[PDB]
Amino acid sequence: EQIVPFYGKHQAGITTAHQTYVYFAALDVTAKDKSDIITLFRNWTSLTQMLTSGKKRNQYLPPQDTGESADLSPSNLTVTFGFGPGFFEKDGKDRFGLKSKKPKHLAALPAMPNDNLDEKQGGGDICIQVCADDEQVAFHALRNLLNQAVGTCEVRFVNKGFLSGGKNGETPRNLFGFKDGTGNQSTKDDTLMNSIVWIQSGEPDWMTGGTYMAFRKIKMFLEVWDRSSLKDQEDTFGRRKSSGAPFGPSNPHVSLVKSTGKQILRRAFSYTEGLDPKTGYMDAGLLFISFQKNPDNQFIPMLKALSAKDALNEYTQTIGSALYACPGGCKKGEYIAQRLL
Amino acid sequence: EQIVPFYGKHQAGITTAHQTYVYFAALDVTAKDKSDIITLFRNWTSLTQMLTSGKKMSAEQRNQYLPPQDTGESADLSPSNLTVTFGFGPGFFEKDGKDRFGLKSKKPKHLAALPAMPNDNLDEKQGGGDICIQVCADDEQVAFHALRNLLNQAVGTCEVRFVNKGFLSGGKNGETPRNLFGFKDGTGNQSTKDDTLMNSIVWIQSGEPDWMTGGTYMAFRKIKMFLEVWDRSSLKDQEDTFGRRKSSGAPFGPSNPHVSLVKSTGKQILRRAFSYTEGLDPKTGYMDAGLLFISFQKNPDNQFIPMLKALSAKDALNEYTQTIGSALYACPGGCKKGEYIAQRLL
Ligand code: HEM
Ligand code: HEM
DSSP states (O other), rough: OOOOOOSSSSOSSSSSOOEEEEEEEEEEOOOSSSSHHHHHHHHHHHHHHHHHHOOOOTSSOOOSSTEEETOOOOOTOOEEEEEGGGOOOOTOOSSOGGGGGGTTSSSSSOOTOOOOOOOOGGGGSSSEEEEEEHHHHHHHHHHHHHHHHHEEEEEEEEEEOOOOOOOOOOOOTTTSSBBOOOTTTOOTOHHHHHHOOOSSSSSOOOGGEEEEEEEEEEEEEEHHHTTHHHHHHHHHHHBBBOOOOOOOOBOOOHHHHHTOOOOOEEEEEEEEEEETTTTTSSEEEEEEEEEEEOOOHTHHHHHHHHHBBGGGTTTHHHHHEEEEEEEEOOOOSSSOOOOOO | OOOOOOSSSSSSSSSSOOOSSEEEEOOOOOOOHHHHHHHHHHHHHHHHHHSSSSSOOOOOOOOOOOOOOOOTHHHHHHHHHHEEEEEEOOOGGGEETTEEEGGGGGGTTSSSSOOOOOTTTOOOGGSSOOOOEEEEEEEEHHHHHHHHHHHTTTTTTTTEEEEEEEEOOTTTSSOOOOOOOOOHHHOOOOTTOOOHHHHHHTTOSSSSSSTTOOOEEEEEEEEOOHHHHTTTSOOHHHHHHHHHTTTTTBBBBOOOOOOHHHHOOOOOEEEOOEEEEEOOOOOSSSSSEEEEEEEEEEEEHTTHHHHHHHHHHHHHHGGGGEEEEEEEEEEEOOOOOOOOOTTTTT
C-alpha cells in the first residue's frame, strides 16, 4: 500500500522517502484572533489524516472534497507544516502572543551578494509542503487544504516541482544531468538524522521532534548550461557527470560545500514553468529544500561559502528565499502545533 | 517495456494510450530556405526515434571540449511510453499574406485559424504557432527531457512561441481519468482500438494533399477553469452544469448542460486533453489552472467547429471557464522507417 503514516513522533515528508512531485505553498495569516488559527490547524490535521490514510452527501452543499483524486491511490502522500518569522512578529507586533515560543534560529536568511530575491516569492507566515508520487494527488491535497484556509489566511505563493529517481533505484538527476542527493546521510539511520535534522532540546517544547526548513528558489540557466562543454560542466561541480565520482576566480561546487564541514538534509525538487517572458527561454530551476536542526550552524555557513566562490553561480541565481520552523510530530488525538494553546 | 513505436502508418500520441504528462510547445519558423526546414525535421526524426525507444546517448570516447549531445537528466529513466507528435499551423503556409516555402499547393483543406467565439478572451501569444510539438510520457522528467533536447536542435531555424505542460492521472484500476472539476473525462470518446471508428473520426484517407494521408487535424484550446468559484458551488449546481452525476457519470434529465449541448451537434472528435496548474494567478490571487484541451479530428469544419459554436452560445460551463488560447494544426501521416517526418517538404 502507498500510505505514509501521518501521526508520529515527527512530521512525515522530512525523512520520508523522496516522492516524485511536490506542491509548496506559503500563506500569510490575516485572522486577528489566535482561536481562528487553532480552528484552522485542527481542521488541517483532520483533513490531512484523511487524505494521507486513503480515506475517500448533501446535494445542496458544496463538495467537501473536490473529487479529482477519487479513483487514485494515496501515492505516499505527505503534508509538512512550518511557521515563518512573521507568524511570531509582524512589523514589530506580537500578533498572537507567541513571542515566548519563538524558536532560537527562526529569522529571515541573511542577504547574499549574488541574490536577486523577489520578496513576493519568499517568506510567509505558514508553509505547506505537499509531496506525492502522483501530481494530481499532490495538487488535490494542497487544493483542499487551501480551501479550508479561506477567511483566516491569504495564499502567498504556490510552487510545484518534480524529481524522478532511477528505474533501478538510482540517485535522481537534477536538470543539469548530475546525480543529486549523494552527499545526504541515510534517512534510515535514526542516529544520523537525530544529529543533523531532529531537535531534541534547547528549543520551545513544540519544536521537540521538529526541525528547520530552508527554502531557496534557484533559477537554472538551462540554455547557457546546454551550450557549455562537458569539461566546463564537470569543472563546475568537481564531479564527473555520469558517474558522480570526484576527479582531480571560483571553486567547484561540491568541494566548496564540504569545506564548511557542515551537513544538512537536502530534499529538493526540479521545476519547469513555460517560457520565461523576459528571456524567451525555458523557465526552470531547483526548488531547494533542506532540513537542519540549527540553520545558523549548518545552513548559513554554506550560503556564505557558496555565495562567494561557487562556480555554479555562473549558471544559477536565487530568486526566492524562506526559512520555516517545523513543529514536532502530531500524536493521534492531537492536532498540528498544538502548542498554540 | 514501456516503449511506443515511433515509426508507423500514423504518428504516435494520437490513438496511443493516454499518458500521464504532456509538454505542448509551439514554434515559429524564422528560417527563409525550405532546405533548413528539411534538415530540422530530419534531425527531429532521428532524435525522436532514439528518445522514444530504449536507446540512450552513448558518447563514451567523446570530446570533453564539446557540449554534451544529450542534456543527460533522463540517463537512468525508462522511456515511459514517450510519444512525440508534430503538426503544422496555418502560419507555416501563410504569414502576413506571403505564401511561404512554395508550399501553397500542399496546404490542407481545413487548415485555418479557428473562428472567433463570443466568450473568447484569446491571448494571441498563447495560441497559434507554425509548428506544434506534443510530448507525452508517464514521467514528467522524461517528457521535459525530450522537449528540451528537441527544442535545442531548433536554434537558428525556429523561435519557441510557448511551452505548456499538463497532467492527467487515470484510475488505479483503469477508471476513466477525472478533470480538475472532479468529473470523469473521456467517456464520450470512441474506442481507440476500433480501427473503423478511428478511420471515420480521426484518420484521413483521401481528399487532402498526400502528406496528410494517415494524418489528422489537432485542435488546441487553453481553457482556464475557475476552481475557487467551482469549489464554492453546490454539488447540484456542479452536476447541473454537465447534466451528469459527478461520482458515477450517469446522465440525468439561457443555459444548456454541457454534455447534451455537445451531443446536439451529432458530431464526434477524439479528445486527448490534460489538466494544468501554474501557481497563483497574479491577476486574481487564486490558483491558475485549467484544461489543455487537445482534440483530433479528420475534418474540423464538420466535427469541431460546430461544437465551438454550440458551446459558446448556451453552455452552462461558460460560467466556470474561459478560453484564453487557441490553435489548429495539421498533423502529417506516420513516418516510415527510412523516411523523416512530413518529408513532403521535398
Ligand atoms: C541549482 C542549485 C544546485 C545544484 C544544481 C546543486 C547540485 C549539487 C550536486 C550535483 C552535488 C553533488 C552530488 C550530491 O551530493 O548531491 C551537490 C552537493 C551538495 N550541495 Fe548542491 N546544488 C545546488 C545548490 C545547493 C545549495 C544552495 C546548497 C546549500 C546552501 C547546496 C548544498 C549541497 C550539499 C550539502 C551537498 C553535499 C556535499 C557533500 O558531499 O557533503 N547545494 N549539489
Ligand atoms: C474545461 C473545459 C471542459 C470540461 C471540464 C469538459 C468536461 C466534459 C465532461 C465531464 C464530459 C462528460 C464525460 C465525457 O464524455 O468526457 C464532456 C463531454 C464532452 N465534451 Fe467537454 N469539457 C470541456 C470542454 C469541451 C470543449 C471546448 C469541447 C469541444 C469544442 C468539448 C467536447 C466534448 C465532447 C465531444 C464530449 C463527449 C460528448 C458525448 O457524450 O458524445 N468539451 N466534457
